[PDB]
Amino acid sequence: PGREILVLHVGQGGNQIGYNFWKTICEEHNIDIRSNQRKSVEEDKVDYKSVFLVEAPDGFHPRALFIDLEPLAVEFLVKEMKLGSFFSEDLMVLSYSGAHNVWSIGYQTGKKLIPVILEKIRDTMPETLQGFLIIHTLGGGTGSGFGSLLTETLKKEFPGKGVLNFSVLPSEVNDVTLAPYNTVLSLNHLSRFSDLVVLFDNTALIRIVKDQLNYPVIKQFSDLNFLIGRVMASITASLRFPGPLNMDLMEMAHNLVALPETKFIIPSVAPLTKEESEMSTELDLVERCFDPTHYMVNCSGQGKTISSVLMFRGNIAIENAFSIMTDIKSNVAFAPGVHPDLGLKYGICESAPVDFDKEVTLLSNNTIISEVFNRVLERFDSLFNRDWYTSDYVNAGTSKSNLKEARDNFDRIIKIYKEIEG
Numbered sequence: 001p002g003r004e005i006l007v008l009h010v011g012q013g014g015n016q017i018g019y020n021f022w023k024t025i026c027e028e029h030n031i032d033i034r035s036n037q038r039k040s041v042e043e044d045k046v047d048y049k050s051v052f053l054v055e056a057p058d059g060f061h062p063r064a065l066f067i068d069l070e071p072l073a074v075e076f077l078v079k080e081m082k083l084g085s086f087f088s089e090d091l092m093v094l095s096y097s098g099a100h101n102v103w104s105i106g107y108q109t110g111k112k113l114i115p116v117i118l119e120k121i122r123d124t125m126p127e128t129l130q131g132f133l134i135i136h137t138l139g140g141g142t143g144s145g146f147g148s149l150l151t152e153t154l155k156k157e158f159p160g161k162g163v164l165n166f167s168v169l170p171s172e173v174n175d176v177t178l179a180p181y182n183t184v185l186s187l188n189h190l191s192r193f194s195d196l197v198v199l200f201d202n203t204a205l206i207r208i209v210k211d212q213l214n215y216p217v218i219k220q221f222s223d224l225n226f227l228i229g230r231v232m233a234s235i236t237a238s239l240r241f242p243g244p245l246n247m248d249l250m251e252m253a254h255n256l257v258a259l260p261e262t263k264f265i266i267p268s269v270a271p272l273t274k275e276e277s278e279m280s281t282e283l284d285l286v287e288r289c290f291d292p293t294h295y296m297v298n299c300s301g302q303g304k305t306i307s308s309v310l311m312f313r314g315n316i317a318i319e320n321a322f323s324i325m326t327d328i329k330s331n332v333a334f335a336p337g338v339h340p341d342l343g344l345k346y347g348i349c350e351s352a353p354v355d356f357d358k359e360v361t362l363l364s365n366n367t368i369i370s371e372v373f374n375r376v377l378e379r380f381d382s383l384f385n386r387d388w389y390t391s392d393y394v395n396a397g398t399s400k401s402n403l404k405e406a407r408d409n410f411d412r413i414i415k416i417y418k419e420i421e422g
């Protein structure tokens with residue numbers, strides 16, 4: 001026993017993303033998400049299912065909680081995707097009132113559910129649990145505020161366990177006008193309590209789906225969220241399947257987090273299709289991951305990499321993975337203080353993702369974070385300097401002074417990344 005992870009999905013986006021993640025995990029372990037059983041004994045591969053799956057005598061269940069302050073997103077998802085016996089009622093922590101896109105309402109209202117959540121966790125969590133993943137968007141009220149509260153709560157209640165966030169930033173034009181306040185409040189909270197924050201945004205996800213997968217239409221968020229699920233599954237693949245070089249959650253965080261504050265990470269994956277996986281080299285895939293076309297956060301350029309983690313999955317030539325390292329260091333811009341021999345952390349797993357020959361996943365700690373975050377700050381200031389939209393934050397326990405305090409800490413983080421850039 002050991003290595004187990006518990007996944008908390010918070011708000012509409014966090015729970016919708018959870019569908020794609022759990023679908024991917026079940027497929028990788030040849031588990032039928034509808035029957036809760038192995039699809040077959042003969043195709044049961046050597047693996048470690050306990051990382052994300054609880055095996056009970058009746059079948060497999062996700063080590064997850066599905067948390068929201070309104071019931072519609074989760075209930076509709078479970079009905080449409082036929083998840084009733086996998087996303088079961090005993091794993092749901094739902095209320096009725098909603099956060100109304102205000103971080104402060106999500107935070108305050110979520111406090112009422114913390115006892116129930118902690119009881120569910122302490123009911124079924126093994127003592128050898130390595131950590132928690134919190135999946136949430138930053139621009140709404142529940143994912144942002146309740147997700148922030150949960151990050152704080154888990155770090156306090158479970159010392160020595162990793163707390164990692166997979167967090168969706170607002171789009172280039174925000175689709176929630178309150179998103180700057182919610183994003184600054186969330187990033188401030190995660191800077192204080194998360195061990196590592198892996199970021200995504202829908203502008204980048206849409207670009208990848210339209211340009212790398214060439215989907216003719218995106219009709220549901222599943223046709224975007226699958227990319228987030230791919231990152232989550234691939235970066236944990238070496239905990240779950242054999243390979244030459246495995247790595248756990250805090251192993252990856254320790255290699256990325258150069259200074260305590262530099263914990264905000266941009267992911268990328270290559271390739272995106274089976275056909276590309278069968279007609280590519282390790283060098284080609286790594287170069288794609290380091291190219292802004294493949295970043296899952298919308299960036300103006302390659303920035304400067306401080307530190308990176310690369311997971312190689314599938315039919316990988318180890319000599320190519322190693323031999324290309326000097327090429328990565330020569331062709332990709334790293335921050336000025338990074339020694340020519342440093343800034344890379346490798347994992348290598350023999351299991352390829354569904355039907356692919358091979359795949360590379362990159363987690364990059366990149367100074368371009370400062371540009372992404374500066375844009376959030378500029379949006380925040382445009383509202384705050386006019387006192388726009390502050391009333392419902394104030395009424396839910398976030399004073400205007402508190403809003404400014406969060407903004408100023410956010411700016412301190414931006415400046416640390418900018419200083420490292422040079």
Ligand SMILES: Nc1nc2c(ncn2[C@@H]2O[C@H](COP(=O)(O)OP(=O)(O)OP(=O)(O)O)[C@@H](O)[C@H]2O)c(=O)[nH]1
Binds near residue numbers: 098099102221224
């Ligand atoms: N990628 C992705 N983004 C989502 C998804 N659902 C919502 N979003 C984004 O999340 C932000 C809105 O937050 P939601 O997750 O809907 O809000 P919530 O966390 O449920 O908070 P409240 O509705 O205020 O209670 C917007 O920027 C949306 O574009 C999703 O399934 N996938």
Ligand code: NA
Binds near residue numbers: 011
């Ligand atoms: Na919602």
Ligand code: NA
Binds near residue numbers: 012140
């Ligand atoms: Na909503």
